[PDB]
Amino acid sequence: QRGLAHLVVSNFRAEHLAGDADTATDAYLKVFFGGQEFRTGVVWNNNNPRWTDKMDFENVLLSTGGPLRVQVWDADAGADDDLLGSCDRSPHSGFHEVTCELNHGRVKFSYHAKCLPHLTGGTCLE
Numbered sequence: 001q002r003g004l005a006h007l008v009v010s011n012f013r014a015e016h017l018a019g020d021a022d023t024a025t026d027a028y029l030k031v032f033f034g035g036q037e038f039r040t041g042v043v044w045n046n047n048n049p050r051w052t053d054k055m056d057f058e059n060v061l062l063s064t065g066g067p068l069r070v071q072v073w074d075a076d077a078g079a080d081d082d083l084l085g086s087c088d089r090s091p092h093s094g095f096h097e098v099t100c101e102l103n104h105g106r107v108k109f110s111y112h113a114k115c116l117p118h119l120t121g122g123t124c125l126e
């Protein structure tokens with residue numbers, strides 16, 4: 001098997017978000033890779049939130065396991081929550097910092113994709 005890596009996504013924070021009409025944003029993130037979904041907790045009333053989450057996607061395929069997707073949401077009453085923006089990146093081996101510009105503000109995070117032993121290259125194919 002080729003294209004395998006250990007993917008870890010962390011250092012989540014966002015700036016100048018706009019999620020409510022009368023108060024500050026109540027943001028949370030949904031992060032997706034290879035059929036797995038992780039959701040952070042909510043940071044109430046803060047347009048510049050930071051989260052302590054470290055998401056370990058275990059052994060994944062950087063070649064074909066779809067993009068790494070980060071959705072920025074604002075918490076309201078659940079079913080009526082606001083989707084503030086979404087970002088897609090095709091992860092590559094090594095350490096990488098990501099900045100996704102949204103309609104208002106931006107979301108930032110880092111990821112480290114380490115090829116599994118015997119594998120090398122941008123997508124661990126070699």
Ligand SMILES: [Ca+2]
Pocket residue numbers: 019020021074075076081082
């Ligand atoms: Ca809202």
Ligand SMILES: [Ca+2]
Pocket residue numbers: 020023024025026044045
């Ligand atoms: Ca609010």
Ligand SMILES: [Ca+2]
Pocket residue numbers: 019020025026074075076
């Ligand atoms: Ca809200």
